[PDB]
Amino acid sequence: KYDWFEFFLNCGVDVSNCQRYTINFDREQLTEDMMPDINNSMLRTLGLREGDIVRVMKHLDKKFGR
Structure with a gap:
């Protein structure tokens, strides 16, 4: 299972929000291979x-050289 908490922490997200977003990403079935597909709209949907x-x-x- 992908470590979303570490990912958010590495992004500079505050520790409380890291917990909440990890719970949400896990529940909503987000995986590492989907990272290139993540955009602003989706992150807004995910809270x-x-x-x-x-x-x-x-x-x-x-990460993706954009």
Whole structure:
């Protein structure tokens, strides 16, 4: 099972939100292979705060060379 908590922490998300977002990603069946498909709309659907959407997308864009 993918460690979403570590991923959010590495994005600079605050520890409380890391817990909440991990619960949500796990429940909603998000996996590592889906990371290239993640966009702002989806993160908003998954309940991320606007600041955290920015942080996570900045990380993913850097990861995937965008």
